[PDB]
Amino acid sequence: MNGIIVDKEKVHPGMPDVVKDAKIALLDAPLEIKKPEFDTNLRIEDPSMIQKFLAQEENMLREMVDKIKSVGANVVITQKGIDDMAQHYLSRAGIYAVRRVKKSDMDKLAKATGASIVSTIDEISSSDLGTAERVEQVKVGEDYMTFVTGSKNH
Amino acid sequence: MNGIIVDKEKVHPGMPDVVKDAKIALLDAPLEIKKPEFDTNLRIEDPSMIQKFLAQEENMLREMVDKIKSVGANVVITQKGIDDMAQHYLSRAGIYAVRRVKKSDMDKLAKATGASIVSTIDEISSSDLGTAERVEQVKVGEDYMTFVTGSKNH
């Protein structure tokens, strides 16, 4: 079996160990919740401010994950980070994900699956995705990494 | 001002910096989401298994946080841990929280606020809570810790 390795472990333990017939979502955008440091009193009359902004971020982050799935992607490889809330939701959608992927690797993966790097989650479609035969998690002795096969050659 | 210090920082940056007229919830139970390591194929026919169990844990964890608030508690001091999803929700309810609190400290706080250590989130009521004048986050030079005033003496 031929292909390349990404020195990145799946972000959630409940994530798939093997993803046959992958549809890679190459992103360059944060999948996190903005956690603003508290500062009430000086933060308007209404206290619920910080409380509802997280409620804001919460649903917006969940929606970004939903949008991903409603595009067929079953694998996410981001150059940016993935929040625990994110990892949770992605894992809930069965999408394999790795975060903070090396810039070099992002391009290597770009031109090898066809996938297009998305900097804006919304401005994405099923066309932006990358194809691969088998995206899976492999154990390189001590650590665990992600392996990619398909769309490279043959 | 008199009182004691707990060498524990609030778990969420969006959490209140000062909590006047506190109603402490002393717990000895996990506020986390069980994250089962994936194992499909060998995990029944239906794939949604891992996916719906997290959905399970998700709402159950959110409910445990809701139950806390519907008891007047505005401060949580647990001996166990607090998940990021948990921290998020607690922060959404405006409850100040610290996790993995030293056993010695848990008792010190017990007999000084009146609060009763709850090992079962459900089996709790407004009577189990502890009283304190001011529960706040103080910065001890390098680190940040939580300070407790009230119900001690005077």
Side-chain angles (χ1 to χ4, degrees), chain A residues 1 3-40 45-151, chain B residues 1 3-40 45-151:
Chain A
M1 198 166 254
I4 48 94
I5 161 182
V6 179
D7 193 7
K8 246 69 171 70
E9 181 178 10
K10 60 174 190 182
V11 304
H12 196 296
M15 283 175 164
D17 272 287
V18 168
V19 174
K20 297 169 178 176
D21 288 81
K23 287 159 281 296
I24 301 179
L26 229 59
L27 327 190
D28 191 343
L31 272 183
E32 310 165 328
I33 279 191
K34 293 183 193 68
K35 302 167 179 295
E37 281 79 279
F38 195 83
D39 190 69
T40 55
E45 273 288 347
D46 183 68
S48 300
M49 259 293 288
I50 283 289
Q51 305 175 68
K52 57 192 171 185
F53 176 62
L54 298 189
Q56 264 265 354
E57 285 292 286
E58 182 181 341
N59 298 89
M60 181 162 107
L61 173 61
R62 206 186 309 105
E63 281 170 9
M64 292 186 128
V65 175
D66 285 313
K67 184 178 297 78
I68 298 302
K69 207 190 170 189
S70 71
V71 134
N74 52 338
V75 172
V76 166
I77 302 170
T78 186
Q79 187 170 163
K80 252 66 182 185
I82 302 181
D83 211 268
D84 275 81
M85 281 266 299
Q87 309 175 345
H88 181 255
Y89 291 141
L90 289 159
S91 202
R92 203 176 177 206
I95 304 175
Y96 189 102
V98 279
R99 60 194 182 163
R100 303 286 174 170
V101 176
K102 183 192 298 76
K103 208 288 170 170
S104 97
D105 293 5
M106 285 301 273
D107 283 330
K108 170 178 294 194
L109 284 164
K111 297 310 165 188
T113 55
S116 306
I117 298 179
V118 181
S119 285
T120 301
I121 275 78
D122 281 76
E123 303 282 347
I124 200 181
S125 53
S126 308
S127 71
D128 294 275
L129 305 187
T131 315
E133 188 176 50
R134 182 134 88 130
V135 169
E136 64 182 300
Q137 173 168 69
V138 297
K139 178 168 162 296
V140 192
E142 262 208 300
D143 309 87
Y144 294 75
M145 280 154 241
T146 174
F147 188 72
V148 181
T149 92
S151 194
Chain B
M1 198 166 254
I4 48 94
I5 161 182
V6 179
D7 193 7
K8 246 69 171 70
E9 181 178 10
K10 60 174 190 182
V11 304
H12 196 296
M15 283 175 164
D17 272 287
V18 168
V19 174
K20 297 169 178 176
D21 288 81
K23 287 159 281 296
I24 301 179
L26 229 59
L27 327 190
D28 191 343
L31 272 183
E32 310 165 328
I33 279 191
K34 293 183 193 68
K35 302 167 179 295
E37 281 79 279
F38 195 83
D39 190 69
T40 55
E45 273 288 347
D46 183 68
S48 300
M49 259 293 288
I50 283 289
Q51 305 175 68
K52 57 192 171 185
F53 176 62
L54 298 189
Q56 264 265 354
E57 285 292 286
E58 182 180 341
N59 298 89
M60 181 162 107
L61 173 61
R62 206 186 309 105
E63 281 170 9
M64 292 186 128
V65 175
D66 285 313
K67 184 178 297 78
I68 298 302
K69 207 190 170 189
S70 71
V71 134
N74 52 338
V75 172
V76 166
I77 302 170
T78 186
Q79 187 170 163
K80 252 66 182 185
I82 302 181
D83 211 268
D84 275 81
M85 281 266 299
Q87 309 175 345
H88 181 255
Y89 291 141
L90 289 159
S91 202
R92 203 176 177 206
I95 304 175
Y96 189 102
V98 279
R99 60 194 182 163
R100 303 286 174 170
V101 176
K102 183 192 298 76
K103 208 288 170 170
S104 97
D105 293 5
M106 285 301 273
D107 283 330
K108 170 178 294 194
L109 284 164
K111 297 310 165 188
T113 55
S116 306
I117 298 179
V118 181
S119 285
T120 301
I121 275 78
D122 281 76
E123 303 282 347
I124 200 181
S125 53
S126 308
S127 71
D128 294 275
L129 305 187
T131 315
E133 188 176 50
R134 182 134 88 130
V135 169
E136 64 182 300
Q137 173 168 69
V138 297
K139 178 168 162 296
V140 192
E142 262 208 300
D143 309 87
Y144 294 75
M145 280 154 241
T146 174
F147 188 72
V148 181
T149 92
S151 194

